[PDB]
Design a protein around this nucleic acid. Structure first.
Lengths: 532, 83, 135
RNA sequence: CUGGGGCGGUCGCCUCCUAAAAGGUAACGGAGGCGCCCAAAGGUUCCCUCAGAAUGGUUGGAAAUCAUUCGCAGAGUGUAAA
RNA sequence: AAGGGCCAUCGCUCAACGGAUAAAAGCUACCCCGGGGAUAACAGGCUUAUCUCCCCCAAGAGUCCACAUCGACGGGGAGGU
RNA sequence: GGGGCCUUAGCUCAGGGAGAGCGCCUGCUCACGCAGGAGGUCAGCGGUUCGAUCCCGCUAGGCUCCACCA
């Protein structure tokens, strides 16, 4: 996505705002991410830079995410030599995925000085560098890179800055001249002729079918800033670029600002890794418990001779006067008047024999009670983990952090008021929820009354959510159903019924084994982020 | 110390197994002499190396075992590359 | 199996059980107690045996109040070893007892029950005893 | 030296217990330290008095630095113990 | 004068620390002499931790039932294989 | 049983204010290489110190060496 074209567009379209922008504040929220709160054009604005390899970019965000509590070394070095700066000029580095800020600032003696901040966004080996104007000497560097990689250039401070080897590509018919169109798969080798290229862009342009026209038209489009910043979604795999989608089936959502496009599109992936690593373990336990009860059930089918012995003891105590001590059998009638032949021990008395039948009934009864208790335990656990996986599917990190501690408390694992999360709702209302079982319970109990309404699934497993004293209109009643169906055992399931019931009948009986009464149910379906 | 150990601690080669393998192939040399994984090394040593055709010449400054990642490259200096 | 959590010296001399006790000679926490008529060392295994014995006989009964604690350790060299070469390693823990000393008490329970429980405990103990009550 | 020898361990000095109310007193008995340090950590003159608690409270938190009453002494005494 | 003496002082974990030499590790079943029951292997003796045997309380097992037979946690003795 | 050494990421292992390589995840890159994150009781207990992987003691495990002459 982040081609030299997108780059060059940004270069002009941010100089539109930040001619001589006064750098009011500097922060480094994450590792490979840096924020400047700059004052330009009589206004304060945010400026995010990222050398985060897959997410390396530049951006201006309404979401000033979080300035850190720790000022890191790189941040403080920027504060040393750029703070209170002045953004004289921006430059595109000749359309490569690289940018330059020509900046001015007074030194520690009030004498004006300048510098060249360079932002190379190459992909896996992007970087951010600061350099002197005249000397071209590097002063700071985010990813120091020693010449052990035997590379052309080097990062380290003090050294004369150098740029990468610019490839032998005509950065802007010439392809029909140079390249033999017989080659095929030319979406590959447009990269071999042009500077700012994505295989996405190359493919979408090659699919326009000899097509120099497409290239020239799109280059004129970009040069004229004629693009349309949208995000494309080809069955997921959400992509975005200056140009719209050209051919594929994917959905498209357009924007007014490339910056807002970047916004709505370093640590998220880490949290995802943690979440998946935990989800694996949870599924292992739930699957294990399910197979455990399968073992117990198929074992149970082989010791079930209780009632026979019960009935035999009954009959023998009823017929304890016709019976010799030494006999093998007993033709006996049931109290439907069948005639049963019960075996005996020819050594024992009928009293002894009947008592033995009662004993065996007692024993089988006991063992079955044991197995049924183990069944109850395992099924409770399985339902607990199933709700847990529902929550983890419909989770946020803020509740995942609580779920981890919940499980460490359950001792499946090993190693304070923020509870709920909400968004917009119908009737201009606010509907709060929690993907964590514990936070959901905290909200259901401590954050609402009894006469309020709880809305959850009318089905096996889903989250729990409600508005503060949820008594709004049917608009909000149906809007809560969308939030319920979104975070459920089957997201995007277009037949999910939601149950709405007074909180006064919310059963606070493992954890999150909450039954419900005073309930109604409405068939509904999942929805989009408009549910927010 | 040994060449294979040195290469690993300096992170020139990522596995001692590979260092042994390439030294047994004899793709490398020291002070213009062919060498082996058990070959001794010290500060001031001049090392010649190959990665297919990529020929490399480097200089030894230090040696140690604990070798944290960034400190590994202080152990030596690149001099030159050829092919 | 009682234990002192922490101790200065893991190894002590054994000592001498001369004379009668200093204190703990009469029941005052409980009603019906037992006292000794000899002197001896007593072990955590002995006291817990007696304790669980009386509590099983009583099955809910009132309160006990043991009146001792095995503070003293006792060593024992390993097996088939010559003499010398340092003091043996610790083995367990011991309470030292003089005569006239009360060991176990009882309250919340009738006299006959108490006497029987304390009889049972005495048979787990090594020493000669007497049944006692509060004045 | 050695509760036979060997192997192990130790070999000189200081402190405590054992040690039996002077002193002294053994064991391959029990616990620990030394093979120094300070040119001010010495001398002298003059000065004053600790540890904790609570309690106050911007940072600062369990825990700074601050202020109050309580406070033979719970602190300190270059170092091990007496 | 060399050199020595007197005074002051330096040089040793001579640490096996009253230090045998400035200077020193092992095998002997191929072995030898002098002595020892002052000191070990067998047996005897004292002890009896251990071993064997006997016994006490008795929960509990024993369908019920402590003691038909077993006997936990614990306790006390005998014998001298 | 005695003496010594060791017990640190999932494995192998370096090291008085947590590291490497290997293996997992990720992008780059069929198959490797290359850049990030995760996973840490520094075996346990106790002690000293302001402060413990580190210094001290005890305990558990592993390994190595010894366990002999009659």
């Amino acid at each position: 996505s982040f081609d030299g074209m997108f780059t060059y567009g940004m270069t002009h379209e941010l100089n539109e705002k930040i001619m001589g922008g006064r750098i009011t504040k500097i922060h480094q929220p994450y590792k490979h991410d840096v924020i400047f709160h700059i004052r330009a054009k009589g206004k304060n604005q945010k400026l995010l830079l990222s050398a985060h390899p897959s997410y390396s970019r530049v951006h201006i965000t309404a979401q000033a995410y979080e300035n850190p509590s720790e000022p890191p070394m790189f941040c403080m070095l920027l504060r040393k030599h750029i703070e209170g700066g002045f953004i004289e000029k921006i430059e595109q580095a000749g359309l490569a995925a690289i940018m330059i800020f020509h900046i001015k600032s007074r030194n520690e003696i009030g004498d004006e000085t300048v510098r060249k901040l360079y932002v190379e966004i190459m992909g896996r080996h992007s970087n951010i560098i600061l350099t002197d104007a005249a000397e071209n000497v590097i002063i700071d560097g985010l990813k120091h890179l020693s010449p052990s990689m035997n590379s052309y250039r080097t990062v380290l401070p003090g050294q004369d800055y150098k740029l990468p080897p610019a490839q032998d590509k005509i950065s802007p018919d010439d392809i029909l001249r140079h390249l033999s169109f017989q080659e095929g798969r030319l979406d590959k080798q447009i990269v071999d002729h042009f500077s700012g290229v994505s295989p996405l862009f190359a493919k979408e342009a090659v699919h326009r079918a000899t097509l120099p026209k497409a290239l020239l038209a799109l280059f004129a489009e970009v040069k004229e800033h004629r693009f349309i910043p949208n995000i494309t979604t080809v069955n997921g795999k959400e992509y975005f670029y200056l140009l719209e989608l050209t051919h594929l089936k994917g959905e498209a959502r357009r924007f007014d600002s490339l910056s807002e496009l970047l916004d709505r599109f370093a640590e998220r992936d880490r949290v995802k890794q943690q979440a998946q690593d935990l989800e694996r373990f949870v599924v292992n336990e739930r699957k294990k418990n399910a197979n455990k009860i399968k073992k117990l059930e198929k074992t149970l089918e082989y010791s079930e001779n209780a009632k026979e012995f019960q009935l035999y003891g009954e009959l023998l105590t009823a017929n304890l006067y016709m019976l010799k001590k030494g006999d093998k059998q007993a033709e006996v009638i049931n109290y439907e008047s069948p005639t049963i032949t019960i075996p005996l021990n020819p050594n024992k008395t009928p009293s002894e024999n009947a008592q033995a039948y009662f004993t065996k009934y007692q024993k089988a009864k006991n063992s079955v009670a044991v197995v049924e208790e183990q069944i109850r335990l395992a099924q409770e656990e399985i339902e607990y983990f199933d709700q847990l996986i529902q929550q983890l599917s419909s989770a946020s990190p803020r509740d995942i952090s609580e779920i981890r501690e919940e499980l460490v408390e359950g001792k499946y694992l090993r190693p304070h008021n923020p509870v709920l999360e909400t968004y917009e709702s119908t009737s201009g209302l606010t509907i709060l929820v929690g993907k964590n079982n514990r936070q959901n319970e905290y909200l259901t109990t401590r954050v609402a009354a009894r006469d309020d309404i709880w809305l959850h699934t009318k089905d096996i497993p889903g989250s729990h959510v409600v508005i503060r004293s949820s008594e709004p209109d049917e608009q909000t009643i149906m809007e809560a159903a969308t939030i319920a169906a979104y975070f459920s055992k089957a997201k995007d399931s277009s037949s999910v019924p939601v149950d709405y019931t007074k909180i006064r009948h919310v059963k606070k009986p493992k954890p999150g084994f909450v039954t419900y009464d005073s309930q109604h149910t409405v068939f509904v379906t999942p929805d989009a982020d408009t549910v927010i | 110390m040994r060449l294979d150990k040195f290469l690993k601690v300096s992170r020139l080669i990522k596995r001692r197994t590979l260092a042994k393998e390439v030294a047994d192939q004899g793709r490398i040399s020291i002070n213009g002499n062919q060498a082996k994984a058990s070959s001794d090394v010290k500060p001031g040593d001049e090392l010649t190396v190959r990665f297919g055709q990529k020929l490399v010449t480097v200089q030894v400054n230090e040696l140690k075992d604990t070798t944290k990642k960034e400190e590994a490259a202080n152990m030596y200096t690149i001099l030159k590359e050829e092919k | 199996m009682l234990l002192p959590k922490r101790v200065k010296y893991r190894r002590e001399h054994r000592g001498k059980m001369r004379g009668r006790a200093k204190g703990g000679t009469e029941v005052h926490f409980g009603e019906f107690g037992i006292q000794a008529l000899e002197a001896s060392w007593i072990t955590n295994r002995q006291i817990e045996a007696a304790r669980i014995a009386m509590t099983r006989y009583m099955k809910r009964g009132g309160k006990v109040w043991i009146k001792i604690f095995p503070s003293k350790p006792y060593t024992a060299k390993p097996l088939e070893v010559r003499m010398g070469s340092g003091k043996g390693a610790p083995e367990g823990w011991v309470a030292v007892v003089k005569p006239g000393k009360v060991l176990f008490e009882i309250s919340g329970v009738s006299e006959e029950v108490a006497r029987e429980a304390l009889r049972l405990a005495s048979h787990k103990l090594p020493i000669k005893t007497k049944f006692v009550k509060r004045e």
